[PDB]
Amino acid sequence: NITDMAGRSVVIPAKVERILLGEGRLFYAVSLLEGQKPFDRIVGWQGDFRKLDTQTYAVYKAKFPQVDNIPLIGPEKVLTLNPDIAIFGLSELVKQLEKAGVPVVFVDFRTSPLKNTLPSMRVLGKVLHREQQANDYIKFYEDNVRKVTEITSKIPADKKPSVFIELRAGAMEECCGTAGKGNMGDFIDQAGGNNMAKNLLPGALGTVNLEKVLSTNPDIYIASGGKAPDNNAPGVSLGAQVTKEQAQSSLQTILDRKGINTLSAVKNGRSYGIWHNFYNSPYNVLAIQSFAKWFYPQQFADLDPNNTMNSLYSQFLAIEPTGTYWVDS
Numbered sequence: 079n080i081t082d083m084a085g086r087s088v089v090i091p092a093k094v095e096r097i098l099l100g101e102g103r104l105f106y107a108v109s110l111l112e113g114q115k116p117f118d119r120i121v122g123w124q125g126d127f128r129k130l131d132t133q134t135y136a137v138y139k140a141k142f143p144q145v146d147n148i149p150l151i152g153p154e155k156v157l158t159l160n161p162d163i164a165i166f167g168l169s170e171l172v173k174q175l176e177k178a179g180v181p182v183v184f185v186d187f188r189t190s191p192l193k194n195t196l197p198s199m200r201v202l203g204k205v206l207h208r209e210q211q212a213n214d215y216i217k218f219y220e221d222n223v224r225k226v227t228e229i230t231s232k233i234p235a236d237k238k239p240s241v242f243i244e245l246r247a248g249a250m251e252e253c254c255g256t257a258g259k260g261n262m263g264d265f266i267d268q269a270g271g272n273n274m275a276k277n278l279l280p281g282a283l284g285t286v287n288l289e290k291v292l293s294t295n296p297d298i299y300i301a302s303g304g305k306a307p308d309n310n311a312p313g314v315s316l317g318a319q320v321t322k323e324q325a326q327s328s329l330q331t332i333l334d335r336k337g338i339n340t341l342s343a344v345k346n347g348r349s350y351g352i353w354h355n356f357y358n359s360p361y362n363v364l365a366i367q368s369f370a371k372w373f374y375p376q377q378f379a380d381l382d383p384n385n386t387m388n389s390l391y392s393q394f395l396a397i398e399p400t401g402t403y404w405v406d407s
Contacts, residue, residue, distance in 0.1 A: 080204050083168060083194050084184035091162050091181055094207050095119060098151075098161035098180075100171075102127025106359040107185065107199065108165075110215045111208035114396045117142055119206075122159045125150040131355060133306050133317035137397050163205055167358070181205065188358040189282045192264035195219070195360055215360070215394060222363045222386055223268070226370040229377050230270030239297035239373055241271040242343075245283070246354055247301035247332050248312025253288050262302070262357050262365065269369035271298070288337050298372065299343035301332050304354035314351040318401035325351060325405035333407060344407075348372075351405035361390065368404050 081087050099105065102123040109116050116138070128135050128150065139145050149159065153174040164175050168186045175182050183205055186194035196216050203212025243262050245255045256275040257263040260282020266273040274294045278286050303314025307324050315328040329351040333344050343349050350372050356365040364383050371378035383404065391399045 080201055082184045082201055083186040083198055086184070088181050088183050088205060090204055091207075094162045094205070096121040096160055096162045097206065098156065098159065098164040099123035099127075100164060100166040102129075102150075103131060103355065103358060104165050104167065104185070106355070106361055107187065107202055108206070109396075110199070110360060110394045111202060111206055111211040112396075113211060113394075116396050117145055117148065120148055121161055122149050122151050122156065124152055131304065131317070133304075133319045133401065137318045137400060141397060165202070187360055187362065188261060190260050190264065191362055192268065195362065199360055211394070218390065218393060219360070219363045223366055225381060226269055226366055226378075229374065230268065230370055233270045233374075235272075238270055238272045239348075240274050240294070241266050241298045241300065241369075241373070242274045242291055242294070242296040243300040243302060243352075244291075245302045245357060246313060247303065248305075248314075248335075250288070250336060252285075253337075254286055254291060256284060256286050257282060257357070258284055262352075262362075265356075265362060265366045265369050268366055269373055271369060271373050292337055292340065295342050297343060297346075297348060299333075299338075299341055299349045300352055300369070300372075301329065301350070302352050302354040302357060303328070303332075314405065316351055316353040316402055316405065320402045322402050322405070325402040326407070329405050329407060347407055349407045353403045364390070364403065372406075 079087050079089050097119045098121060103126050105127045153171040157178050161180055164180055164182045166184045168184055168189050172182050185198035199212050199215055203209035243256055258275050258279025258281060263273045263276055274296050275286050301314050303316050305313040305315045307315050307320055314332055315324045333349050352365055356362040364387055367381055367383045367386060371381055387399050
């Protein structure tokens with residue numbers, strides 16, 4: 079048995095051939111364990127991966143066409159799929175699954191990734207019978223996070239830059255979603271940064287008013303986006319099918335927005351783009367290195383997040399790294 083990130087004790091199954099995903103983008107965690115057979119055990123998912131990550135989906139589809147046949151689940155009807163195990167993030171469904179004697183498990187990469195990333199992966203290894211893959215990944219993640227924290231962990235406060243991250247930036251009106259105590263806040267923290275939104279928000283996630291961003295006037299501005307290139311909505315295009323030019327053209331439109339454009343971060347050339355889905359992915363070690371390299375360019379000269387992404391895809395994944403995951407002005 080094992081305790082999940084909700085604190086509930088779950089009986090490790092004797093048989094796992096059929097996995098259910100309550101958020102499609104839990105795929106990122108599972109992709110790390112399934113090796114060269116990523117979709118062999120997936121019997122169903124919520125459509126956020128297929129729909130809110132069309133780009134990655136499409137790369138996988140090219141190599142595994144059968145991905146299209148996995149049903150989208152958006153409570154009696156999910157049982158027909160016959161899951162050995164169901165996975166959730168932090169319902170009638172959860173009851174319906176436990177009433178049917180189906181092991182349910184909650185993980186976390188969104189609310190508190192500092193705390194819950196590696197524990198979540200450890201849990202998954204056990205309950206998916208992929209402990210070796212999970213422990214391999216922990217070792218990887220740890221060594222790559224260590225490259226940052228070695229340097230950033232004892233940096234005095236007056237050395238540290240102030241940082242603001244506008245999550246899924248775009249559209250003066252939504253402005254500005256951000257992370258506080260949690261989420262990418264944790265990566266700032268760790269990268270030797272100083273999240274301005276931290277003491278404005280109770281939660282990991284939330285919305286701050288543009289006025290406060292301009293008034294605070296942070297050293298560094300980061301915008302998260304995962305917008306597909308053909309998606310011409312407000313936001314940073316980034317992902318598996320984005321070019322560097324598209325990332326920059328689109329990052330610029332975001333920095334050119336009203337208010338934003340007057341920021342010292344914009345004028346001082348300290349504006350960056352980061353792939354949004356690291357806000358809820360165990361791949362977020364890539365974001366940690368990039369933030370630290372943006373924050374202390376000279377100290378992280380020898381560091382290359384692309385080498386790390388290549389190293390990850392080759393060790394763990396069944397597709398090739400393509401596209402643009404980060405960008406500078």
